[PDB]
Nucleic acid binder design. Structure first.
Lengths: 121, 252, 101, 233
RNA sequence: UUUACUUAUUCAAUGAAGCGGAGCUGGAAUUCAUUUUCCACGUUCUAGCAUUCAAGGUCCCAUUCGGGGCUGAUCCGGGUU
RNA sequence: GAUGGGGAAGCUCCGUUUCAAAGGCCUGAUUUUAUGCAGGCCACCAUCGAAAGGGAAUCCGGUUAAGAUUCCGGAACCUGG
């Protein structure tokens, strides 16, 4: 014959058994393959006179890239494809709704070498 | 028949109280164990101008009984208090100006202010600049006390209703003329938007009952009923008499 | 079928046995939410004849509805129609409260 | 004895923090709690009728204990035992060929509220137990009337859960003995006499008694200090 | 026409903390057979300070870094008022 | 401006800290321990709302047909780790 001993003047909900999920089936069919892989990141290079002027001096690749991408994906994708060490990567959305990326390599590598190696000149 | 000025005033769109610069609620401390058994002290830190209330405020700070901290309260400052005067509160507090005693504990002829209407409502009566109540006798059985409100009319209220000792500050506020429209404007723009006031007799008959006519005049009687509805009321409400008085008043 | 006895007891509503229970239950219900799941039917006999068989599937919901007439909405008591359609207080709403509930 | 100084704290309203006390008095319980407690309190406060308050008058823990000793011998079957009987009858239908006379007659308790009623109406019920609860009190209330009318003893026992426990459900509120093995038959009579002394023969007296109108501890105190001490002191 | 009970209803409060009843204990106090009662029942010269299941005292684990219980903070009804 | 709630035949209305059981917090366990567990804690209580209010930190020189306190050169600073 006894009670409990409450000292604070209010009641509160018990921090009960927070039971984790254990569902009898999977949500969807199979894990959706990588939406945004290295090929789906960078689409094309850019051949305009300005771009080449940059390449020949700045050590700077130029790319059209998918919108869903960001500087991290870009600095991954470039390494994964072209076997490079990348510096600073600066992006804009062009007037026509296409993401332009300016990708400077480290001083180790040459741009104009990697430009005609990939194909465009 | 356009909806008249006064009718709009309750809708609450523009007319609501302008309360940016207002310091806080001018309430007493919660009536608890400590205050209704013995007494309890504090210090007053700040006394400060609240805007839209001529009576200056009194920021007082007590120690909470039930935890280690300083919980702050804000009375309407009674005349003759100073920053870092002690302020004693509750049942066995002294009868010195600033303290908040129950109404049974005071004598009769006693001047208090900010007196509660009933036990633990935290301020109610005599809370204006200059005004004050006068406790004018106990009714010790069924513990009430009979008090003199600043209008003149009397009241019977519990002795357990606290009220703070002394007058309220800023007395003789209205002694000065407001002098120029600008000052009036400045006064009112920190209260609400009930200024300036166009006279009903000026505006057109759609706007307000008094309105219209070739000459600026009322035409029907101005004193209207207590029983008259919203929008009819735009005169002298349910007047038991009117015109200029003669003689000494508080007419007992 | 002891339910018959229950039915007869319920039918004697004004008797002190029931208008005693009434006064408890009316308080009890006016303290909970307006709509709320009843655990078990109060008058199971009645429930049973309305087509309820106490097993998994059948759920009972206790609900209140506010009483008396439907006031017509129309702001500041206007109407703008011909004198016939100026009713505000006295109109009464075709479906019963039971329905609303 | 060491250098450890004594320093008492003055809890004198104003100075020092008034520290932890057990405030199981004050604390703000949830709405449901409040509903149940005040339902109880309210039921006590009101002037309750004759036909209710025949309940709350109950069977005490000793005689009741003897009752549960008696009845509990006659629990009905579980899954294991029903399965056993199924096996028995399966065996005996082929070889013995007795038309429903392989196992004995069962002498365990007969129950079910409707069933109980149907027994009482033909006097086939020889004893009937009744729990005080059943929140829809509609159900159980009229049994006292059948029992007193049909010359049957009725025992307002406590806990519908206890009645449940013997009959192997969660609840019951009604358990009755019709048949019984002529062995614990003296104690049966002893009960019948005892039960009838407690509840049954006072039914008419109960018919005049009004329970309730029972004020709370503080209300009672107020009544005492004020209403008693006017002539007395 | 008064006036009483309170559980419905209503209004208010507030991290719904100190309600009522009963006490020790100290004053007034009649005591008439030791009570009948009634008040108190921890803080007012000072703009500081007050928290770590509180120190203290005490009984059990084990005193090997220590740990739990009672009290200190009187009890019962747990109706928050 | 949601939720709790309360209105309204309903479209939806009030209200936003409210008659709610509204939540998270750092520490120990460790070498069954994943985060549960022996604990203490703290009560407010969503959310949106100002490229003129509050706001962590960048400046110079050069460079383009059109860009820069954003690129190149040079020199800094802050933040989290």
């Amino acid at each position: 014959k006894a009670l409990k001993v409450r000292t604070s003047a209010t009641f509160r909900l018990p921090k009960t058994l927070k039971l984790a999920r254990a569902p009898k089936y999977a949500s969807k069919a199979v894990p959706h393959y990588n939406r945004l892989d290295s090929y789906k990141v960078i689409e094309q290079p850019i051949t305009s006179e300005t771009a080449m002027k940059k390449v020949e001096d700045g050590n700077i690749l130029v790319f059209q890239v998918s919108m869903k991408a960001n500087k991290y994906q870009i600095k991954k994708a470039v390494k994964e494809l072209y076997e490079v060490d990348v510096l600073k990567v600066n992006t804009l959305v062009r007037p026509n709704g296409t993401k332009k990326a300016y990708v400077r390599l480290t001083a180790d590598y040459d741009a104009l070498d990697i430009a005609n190696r990939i194909g465009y000149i | 028949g356009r909806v008249i000025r006064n009718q709009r005033k309750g809708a609450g769109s523009i007319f609501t109280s302008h309360t940016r610069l207002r310091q806080g609620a001018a309430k007493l401390r919660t009536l608890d164990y400590a205050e209704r058994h013995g007494y309890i002290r504090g210090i007053v830190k700040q006394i400060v101008h609240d805007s839209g209330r001529g009576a200056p405020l009194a920021k007082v700070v007590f120690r909470d009984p039930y935890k280690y901290r300083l919980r702050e309260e804000i009375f309407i400052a009674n005349e003759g208090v100073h920053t870092g005067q002690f302020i004693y509160a509750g049942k066995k507090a002294s009868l010195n100006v600033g303290n908040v005693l129950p109404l049974g504990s005071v004598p009769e002829g006693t001047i208090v202010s900010n007196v509660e209407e009933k036990p633990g409502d935290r301020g109610a009566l005599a809370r204006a600049s200059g005004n004050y109540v006068i406790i004018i006798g106990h009714n010790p059985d069924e513990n009430k006390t009979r008090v003199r409100l600043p209008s003149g009319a009397k009241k019977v209220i519990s002795s357990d209703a606290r009220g703070v000792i002394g007058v309220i500050a800023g007395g003789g506020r209205v002694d000065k003329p407001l002098l120029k429209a600008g000052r009036a404007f400045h006064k009112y723009r920190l209260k609400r938007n009930s200024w300036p006031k166009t006279r009903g007799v000026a505006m057109n008959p759609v706007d307000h009952p008094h309105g219209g006519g070739n000459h600026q005049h009322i035409g029907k009687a101005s004193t209207i009923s207590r029983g008259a509805v919203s929008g009819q009321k735009a005169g002298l409400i349910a007047a038991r008499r009117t015109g200029l008085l003669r003689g000494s008043q508080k007419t007992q | 079928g002891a339910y018959k006895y229950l039915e007869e007891l319920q039918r004697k509503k004004q008797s002190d046995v029931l208008r005693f229970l009434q006064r408890v239950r009316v308080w009890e219900y006016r303290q909970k939410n307006v709509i709320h799941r009843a655990a078990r039917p109060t008058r199971p006999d009645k429930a049973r004849r309305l087509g309820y068989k106490a097993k998994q599937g059948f759920v009972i919901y206790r609900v209140r509805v506010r009483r008396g007439n439907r006031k017509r909405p129309v702001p500041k008591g206007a109407t703008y129609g011909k004198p016939t359609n100026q009713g505000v207080n006295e109109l009464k709403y075709q479906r019963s409260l039971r329905a609303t509930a | 004895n060491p250098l450890t100084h004594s320093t008492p704290k003055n809890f004198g309203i104003g100075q020092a923090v008034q520290p932890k006390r057990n405030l199981s008095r004050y604390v703000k319980w949830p709405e449901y709690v409040r509903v149940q407690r005040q339902k109880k309190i309210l039921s006590i406060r009101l002037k309750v009728p004759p036909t209710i308050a025949q309940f709350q008058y109950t069977l005490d823990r000793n005689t009741a204990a003897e009752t549960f000793k008696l009845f509990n011998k006659y629990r009905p079957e579980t899954a294991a035992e029903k399965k056993e009987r199924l096996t028995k009858e399966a065996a005996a239908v082929a070889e013995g060929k007795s038309k429903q006379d392989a196992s004995p007659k069962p002498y365990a308790v007969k129950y079910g509220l409707n069933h109980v009623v149907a027994l009482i109406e033909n006097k086939k019920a020889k004893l009937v137990l009744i729990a005080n609860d059943v929140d829809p009190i509609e159900l159980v209330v009229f049994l006292p009337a059948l029992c007193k009318k049909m010359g049957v003893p009725y025992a307002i026992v406590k806990g519908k859960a206890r009645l449940g426990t013997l009959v192997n459900q969660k609840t019951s509120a009604v358990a009755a003995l019709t048949e019984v093995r002529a062995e614990d038959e003296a104690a049966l009579a002893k009960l019948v006499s005892t039960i009838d002394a407690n509840f049954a023969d006072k039914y008419d007296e109960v018919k005049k008694h009004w329970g309730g109108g029972i004020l709370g501890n503080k209300a009672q105190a107020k009544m005492d200090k004020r209403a008693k001490n006017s002539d007395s002191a």
